Write a structure and sequence with these properties.
Chain B: One of its GO terms (cellular component) is mitochondrion. This is part of a larger assembly, with chains A (62 residues) and B (58 residues). Chain A has 62 residues and is mainly alpha-helical. Chain A is 73% helix and 0% strand. Chain A is built from two helices and no strands. Chain A has helices at 2-30, 44-59. The N and C termini of chain A lie far apart (90 Å). Chain B is low in regular secondary structure. Chain B is 0% helix and 0% strand. Chain B contains no helices and no strands. Classes of the chains: A mainly alpha (62), B little secondary structure (58). Chain A binds chain B through residues 9, 12-13, 16-17, 20, 31-35, 38, and chain B through 36-39, 49-50, 53. Bound molecules: 1,2-diacyl-SN-glycero-3-phosphocholine (PC1). 1,2-diacyl-SN-glycero-3-phosphocholine (PC1) is lined by residues 56-58 of chain B.
């Protein structure tokens, strides 16, 4: 019964390993999810520069 | 014509008018219904099933 329990645990670990390999392959195929296989491109600096350029329109004067 | 000449900087200030023409449109936010979904902050985190699932571990 100890070998039966260890075989059941190792078999379930094998199925979860195969399923996470499939999930990681489908995630790297499409680059969909935000955890792995995702390059975070941010426009924070573009919005900061646009806000600064909008702020310096008020500063234009004499 | 009985007209008064304005000051030196009368025409270089900001002009406020009551324009009859309606403003065209407010800048609407672009809708992206299928973005990249992250893990939410309200998502529960139970412990992992058989741990790390590495070689000889958990
Ligand atoms: C060769 C030297 C390097 C050996 C590296 C692996 C050692 C075994 C190990 O770390 O097992 C983790 C497991 C513990 O893992 P576990 O199965 O209890 O669960 C993992 C849980 N974490 C990761 C949070 C700790 O240890 C054992 O199973 C007992 C090992 C006893 C000692 C066996 C090796 C003797 C020393 C080396 C002699 C040469």
């Amino acid at each position: 019964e100890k070998s039966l329990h260890y075989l059941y645990e190792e078999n379930e670990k094998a199925q979860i390993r195969l399923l996470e390999d499939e999930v990681r392959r489908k995630m790297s195929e499409r680059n969909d999810y935000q955890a792995y296989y995702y390059r975070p491109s941010v426009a924070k600096y573009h919005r900061i520069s646009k806000e600064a350029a909008d702020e310096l329109e008020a500063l234009r004067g004499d | 014509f009985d007209w008064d000449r304005p000051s030196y900087g009368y025409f270089s200030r900001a002009k406020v008018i009551q324009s009859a023409r309606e403003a065209p449109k407010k800048e609407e936010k672009v809708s992206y219904p299928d973005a990249t979904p992250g893990l939410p902050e309200d998502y529960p985190k139970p412990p992992a099933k058989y741990g790390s699932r590495f070689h000889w571990l958990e």
